[PDB]
Structure 1
Amino acid sequence: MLAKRIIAALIVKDGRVVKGSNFENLRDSGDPVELGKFYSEIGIDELSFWDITASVEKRKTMLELVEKVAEQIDIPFTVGGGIHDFETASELILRGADKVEINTAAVENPSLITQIAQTFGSQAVVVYIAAKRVDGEFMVFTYSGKKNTGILLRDWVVEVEKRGAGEIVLGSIDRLGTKSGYDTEMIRFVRPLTTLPIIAHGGAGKMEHFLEAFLAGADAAKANSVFHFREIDVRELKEYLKKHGVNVRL
């Protein structure tokens, strides 16, 4: 096992952190660049930016975001979504992003994974897999949970690795937003199907959820509002995890 990673996820729109931040020490607590800079200073391992701008502004806003973030931070960052083709992924990586996160366009064109990997390496290619239980099967969902693709999680995972992806963000639509814990059953289901790093996403509410997700086989854990609304202190979380046997970077 490589050291576990703790990832702060920021939802951004029109250059702003959606829903903001409770950090009163910051000049603009809704500024994604200063928010991410703060995170890198207090021990977050990577950032993840997820843009929900509506084009015509999207493309320019996302490039501008990555340009500004890369000015200010030293730690790895990922950008997504609405990433639909190689040209879009490529400009974002070139402008400063370490990795891109793709979901819907990867499901609809799995060779998109391979096109990007062929130029930027597998490590630059994160596949976000959103899944949910449907009649007792884990099914893959696209379009921000709007579409049941009818594809089994089991099959998609294996395919994603085969096409050349470097990491899988495993999102549980069953736990997303709930603060009730990571979907450790989903993680344990995926763990033996792939040699790729698995990032848990969806469900974080307290520090113990992270320990549970790492026991399940996650390589990393991503969270949003528990960090921004300061329900979990990043330093406390890492101390907590190290205390209980987790190999985290301190």
Structure 2
Amino acid sequence: LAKRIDAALIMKDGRVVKGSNFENLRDSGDPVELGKFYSEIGIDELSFWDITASVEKRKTMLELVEKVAEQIDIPITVGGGIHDFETASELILRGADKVEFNTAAVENPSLITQIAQTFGSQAVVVYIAAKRVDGEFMVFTYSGTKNTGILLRDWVVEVEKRGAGEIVLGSIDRLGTKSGYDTEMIRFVRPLTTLPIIAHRGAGKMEHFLEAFLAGADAAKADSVFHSREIDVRELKEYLKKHGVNVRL
């Protein structure tokens, strides 16, 4: 019942990279400054997804989490090429509240459980990227590029069994669109898990958020719509209250 509004930030070499081509002379790509803006306009949680080159990535991500954790006080999730237990554990110890796995969880589902048993299920988020292929929802890894042959309906159940705290449900069919979350995919996954479901991909207007929530999402994640100011968050959370949704205000 209690719904959340989450912001996603793409990170490269320690700086925020915008997901569209809007600009502003003052808007620096400093994650701490952007994190403070989000914290201060009432975003519930932040996720960072790091696309940095192989070689500097692991210390770049540790540096990032240390700076943002000192300075902001909403939960932070970190992800993007977290391959193993040691990497994830180092990030949680340097300050991240949660780590997000996709490819490595698919390839080694025990990883979910190892993190959950050490730091608590709350610390493990599994991002499931899914697409319709020949009439069925399949799971994709390597940033939407490898069809794993695993059914979405099988992987959701297994993720919960392994001890994940939450699922982000990213519709590859909604990637590059701004006409709404994949409410059909949301409805399909909802009876298969008791976990919080975070909807991702497709957000364009305030109504979209309403509709995801009514399809059974517990949170909705977006990037551009908030960074560009195209949706004012206080206004989003007042609209949602008015339409029957329990949000923090």
Give the TM-score band, short-chain normalised.
over 0.9
The C-alpha deviation readout for 1:14-65, integer Å capped at 9, x for no partner, is: 1111128999999553111110111001100000100000021100110011
Is the 1:21–1:228 Cα contact (8 Å) retained in structure 2? no
Q: 1:13 & 1:162 partners in 2: Cα distance?
A: 33
- For normalisation by structure 1, the TM-score amounts to 0.96
**Structure-2 separation of matches of 1:125 and 1:101:** 6
C-alpha separation in 1, matches of 2:119 and 2:128 = 20
Alpha-carbon distance in 1 for matches of 2:158, 2:20: 37
Q: Report if the CA contact (8 A) 1:188-1:216 is conserved.
A: yes
* CA shift digits 1:76-124 (9 cap, x unpaired): 1100010010000000001000000000000011111011111011110
Distance 1:138 1:25 in 2: 39
Can you give the 5+ residue segments of structure 1 that lack an aligned partner in the other structure?
A: none
* Contact preservation (8 Å) 1:182, 1:202: yes
Residues 119/26 of structure 1: CA separation in 2 closer, same or farther (3 Å cut): farther
Change (3 A) 1:243 1:25: farther
Q: What SS does the aligned partner of 2:19 have?
A: coil
Q: CA deviation at 1:236?
A: 1.0
Q: Say if 1:7 and 1:163 are closer, same or farther in 2 by CA, change over 3 A.
A: same
Residues of 2 paired with 1:184 and 1:103: CA distance? 21
Distance 1:134 1:101 in 2: 25
User: Does structure 2 conserve the Cα–Cα contact (< 8 Å) formed by 1:167 and 1:197?
Assistant: yes
CA contact (8 A) 2:19 2:224 kept: no
Instruction: Indicate if the aligned counterparts of 1:93 and 1:100 stay in contact, CA closer than 8 A.
Output: yes
Matches of 1:147 and 1:15 in 2, distance apart? 27
8 Å contact from structure 1 (residues 49, 79) kept in 2: yes
Give, in whole Å, the separation in 1 of the partners of 2:220 and 2:228: 17
Please tell me whether the aligned partners of residues 117 and 164 of structure 1 are also in contact (alpha carbons under 8 angstroms): yes
| 192 and 26 in structure 1: CA distance in 2 versus 1, 3 angstrom threshold | farther
* C-alpha distance in 2 between matches for 1:231 and 1:225: 8
CA contact (8 A) 1:17 1:31 kept: yes
Q: Is the 8 A contact 1:22 1:228 kept in 2?
A: no
Between stretches 122-131 and 25-34, larger displacement belongs to 25-34
SS at match of 2:168: strand
The CA distance in 2 between the partners of 1:22 and 1:143, in whole Å, is 25
1: CA distance between counterparts of 2:42 and 2:88? Answer: 27
Separation of aligned partners in 1, 2:102 and 2:200: 14
Secondary structure in 1 matching 2:178: coil
Question: Is the CA contact 2:19–2:223 (under 8 Å) kept in the aligned structure 1?
Answer: no
Taking a change above 3 Å as real, the CA distance of residues 164 and 34 of structure 1, as seen in their structure-2 partners, is same
Does structure 2 conserve the Cα–Cα contact (< 8 Å) formed by 1:26 and 1:34? no
Q: State how many pairs are aligned.
A: 249
* Closer/same/farther in 2, CA of residues 116 and 26 from structure 1, 3 Å limit: farther
The two structures have a TM-score, normalised by structure 2, of 0.96
1:19 corresponding residue in structure 2: 18
Q: In 2, are the aligned partners of 1:103 and 1:127 still within 8 Å (CA)?
A: yes
C-alpha separation in 2, matches of 1:77 and 1:177:
25
Q: Is residue 105–residue 126 contact of structure 2 (8 Å, CA) maintained in 1?
A: yes
State the 1:177 CA deviation.
2.5
8 Å contact from structure 1 (residues 22, 230) kept in 2: no
Q: Give the SS at the match of 2:241.
A: helix
